[PDB]
Amino acid sequence: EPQPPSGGLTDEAALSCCSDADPSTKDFLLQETMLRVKDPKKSLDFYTRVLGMTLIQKCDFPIMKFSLYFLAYEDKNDIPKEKDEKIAWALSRKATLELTHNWGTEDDETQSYHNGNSDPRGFGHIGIAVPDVYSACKRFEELGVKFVKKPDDGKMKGLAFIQDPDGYWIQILNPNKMATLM
Amino acid sequence: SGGLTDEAALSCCSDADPSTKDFLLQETMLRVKDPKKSLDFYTRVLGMTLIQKCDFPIMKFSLYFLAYEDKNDIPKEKDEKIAWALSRKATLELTHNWGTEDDETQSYHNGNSDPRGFGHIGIAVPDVYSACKRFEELGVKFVKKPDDGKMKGLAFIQDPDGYWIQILNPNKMATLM
Ligand SMILES: CCCCCCSC[C@H](NC(=O)CC[C@H]([NH3+])C(=O)O)C(=O)NCC(=O)O
Ligand SMILES: CCCCCCSC[C@H](NC(=O)CC[C@H]([NH3+])C(=O)O)C(=O)NCC(=O)O
Ligand SMILES: [Zn+2]
Ligand SMILES: [Zn+2]
C-alpha cells in the first residue's frame, strides 16, 4: 500500500532521464571548478609543487578585494604572451581550477572555508588521474601532504584522498586499474 | 595584506616535477538529492553526456559521470568503458545517497552562503546571450542573467540542487567590466 523508499535508479531509469545534446549546446565545455582559498601562497605552492599544475592566469579586482588564480595541467609554453590572447586562452581550457582569494583571510585566525564533507554537505572533492597511485602517494608522504584516505585503507584499494591547504578533498586514482577493484 | 603581486604569485609557483607527468584533473564531485532531476538538467539543459553509472548497493549510493563527450566514443566493453570514463578531462561526478529524494527536509548546501567553500562550476559557451535565452525559455533558475548586476556578458544559473553554474564566453572578457 505505502510507496517504497526510493533506492538507486536502474540503468534503464537513468537513461530514461538523459536527453541527447541540443545543437545549441554543441561547443559548450566544462571549463572550471571554483574553490575559495584562505591563503593563496599556500594553495599556489600546493597545486604547483605537489600536484604539478600550472598557474595560467591571475586576475585582481581591487574594488571587490579579491583575486582569482587559474590553474590547469597545461604546458607553460602554450601560454600566449599577449594579454588579451592570454585571457581568452586561459579561460577557454577544459578542466581548470579557479582559486578565489578574498583579501585578508590569510591574516584572520578565526576564518576558514568549509570543505563540504561534514554538515552541511554539498560539494565533495576534485579528482586527479595519475599513472601510479602508490608511487604518487609515496611522494605525497615524503612531502608532508595530509591524507583523508591512504591507498590501502578502507574498502576501496588503490584509491586515495589527500587534502589541500584549506582542507578540500582530492581524489587520487589510476583509471587503468579501477575495473579490477570493482 | 591586500592581494599578491604578480611577482609574488609566480615566486610561490614551482615547475611541474617529472613525477607529475601525465597527471590530469579528471573530476569535480557534487552530491545530488535527486538523480532523475540532475540527469535531466545536465543532459537536456547543459548538453552533457552520461558516460558511466556505478552503483554501490552495500554503501547505498550511486555515481553518475557526466562530460562533454561524443556518446559514440563510449567504449562498448565494460572494463574498457570504466577506464575511459575515469580518464576523461573535465568530468562531472554526481553522488546520490539513496533515499534523499524522499526526505523533504533534506537538501545539499551550495557553498555560496555560510559556511562557504566551493562556489561554482563553469561552462564556456560561444554566446552567453543566446545560451541564456534558451535557458530562460526552459525555465532554468538564474542567480544572475548576463546583464544583471556589475559584470556584463556573464551569467550564473542553478542546477536542481541549487549549485551555481557560471556561463561565460571566453572571447568576450573586454566588456566584462
Ligand atoms: C577572468 C575573469 C573570470 C570571470 C570573472 C567572474 S568573477 C565572478 C564573481 N566572483 C566573485 O565575486 C568571487 C569573490 C567573492 N567574494 C566570493 O567569495 O565569491 C561572482 O561570484 N559573481 C557572482 C554574483 O554576481 O553573484
Ligand atoms: C568507478 C569508481 C570511481 C571511484 C569510486 C570511489 S567513490 C569515493 C567514496 N564516495 C562516497 O563514499 C560517496 C557516498 C558518501 N555517502 C558521500 O555522500 O560522500 C568516498 O568518499 N570514499 C572516501 C573515504 O574513504 O573517506
Ligand atoms: Zn568562476
Ligand atoms: Zn570522486
Query: Is the separation of the CB atoms in B127 and B54 below 8 Å?
Result: no
What is the number of other CB atoms lying within 10 angstroms of the CB of residue A158? Answer: 17
Q: Which three cell numbers stand for residue B46?
A: 547543459
What is the pairing mode between strands A146-149 and A123-129?
unpaired
Give strand pairing partners of A125: A169, B29
Give the helix ranges, DSSP H, for A47-123: 83-90
Judged by DSSP in three states, B80 sits in helix
Angle at A95 between CA A93 and CA A97, to 5 degrees: 100
Count of alpha carbons within 13 angstroms of residue B20, beta-carbon side:
22
Which letter does DSSP use for residue A2 in this model?
A: P
Neighbours of B149 (CB within 10 A): 12
CA atoms within 13 A on the CB side of B119: 17
Beta bridge partners of A122: B109
Residue A21: name the closest of B125, B35, B171 by CA.
Answer: B125
Q: What is the CA radius of gyration of chain A?
A: 20
**Grid coordinates given for A25:** 549546446
Amino acid at A172: I
Determine the Cα–Cα distance for residues B90 and A33; give it in Å rounded to an integer. Answer: 9
Q: Which of B158, B91, B172, B71 is nearest to B126 (CA)?
A: B172
Helix, strand, coil percentages for chain B (3-state, nearest 5)? 25, 30, 45
Q: What is the DSSP string of B21-87?
A: TT-EEEEEEEE-S-HHHHHIIIIIIT--EEEEEEEETTTTEEEEEEES--GGGS-SSHHHHHHHHTT
Q: Judge whether A138 is closer than 8 Å to chain B, CB to CB.
A: no
Give the end-to-end CA distance of chain B in Å, rounded to a whole number: 24
Using CB atoms within 10 A of its CB, is residue B142 exposed (0-12), middle (13-18) or buried (19+)?
Answer: middle
* Residue nearest to ligand 1 atom 24, measured at CA: B144
Q: What sign for the dihedral angle of Cα A17, A23, A27, A33? A: negative
Ramachandran angles phi, psi of A47, nearest 5°: -65, -35
**Contacts (Cβ under 8 Å, ≥6 apart) of B147:** B153
Rounded Cα distance between B177 and B157, Å, is 20
Phi, psi angles (nearest 5°) of residue A169: -80, 145
At A11, is the secondary structure helix, strand, or coil? helix
The grid coordinates of residue B119 equal 562556489
Distance CA A46, CA A75 (A): 18
How many other C-beta atoms can be found within 10 angstroms of the C-beta atom of residue A84?
11
Rounded Cα distance, A44 and B11, in Å = 9
Ligand nearest to the CA of B128: 1
**Do A31 and B90 lie within an 8 Å CB cutoff?**
yes
Give the cell for residue A134. 602508490
Distance of CA A141 to the CA centre of its chain: 20
CA separation for the pair A55, A69 (Å, rounded): 7
| Pairing verdict, β A96-102 and A66-72 | antiparallel
Q: What angle do CA B125, B126, B128 make, to 5 degrees?
A: 70
Helix (H, G, I), strand (E, B) or coil at B97: strand
Sign of torsion, CA B156 B114 A68 B120?
negative
CA distance B51 to B73: 9
**For chain B, what's the residue count?**
177
Q: Which residues make beta-bridge pairs with A36?
A: A100
Tally Cβ neighbours within 10 Å of residue A100.
18
Write the CB contacts of A175 (distance below 8 Å, at least 6 apart in sequence). A129, B26, B82, B83, B84, B86, B87
Q: All domains of chain A, ordered by start, with CATH?
A: 1-182 (3.10.180.10)
- How much is the CA Rg of chain B, to the nearest whole Å? 19
Tell me how the structure was determined: X-ray
Tell how far the Cα of B122 is from the centroid of ligand 3, in angstroms. Answer: 6
> Are residues A92 and B171, on separate chains, in Cβ contact within 8 Å?
yes
Please tell me which of the candidates A27, A87, A171 has its beta carbon nearest to residue B126: A27
Instruction: Report how far apart the first and last C-alpha atoms of chain A are (Å, whole number).
Output: 36
Which residues have CB under 8 Å from A49's CB, separation 6+? A143, B13, B14, B17
Collapsing DSSP to helix, strand or coil, A12 comes out as helix
CB–CB contact B115 A115 (8 Å): no
Q: What angle do CA B41, B42, B48 make, to 5 degrees?
A: 145
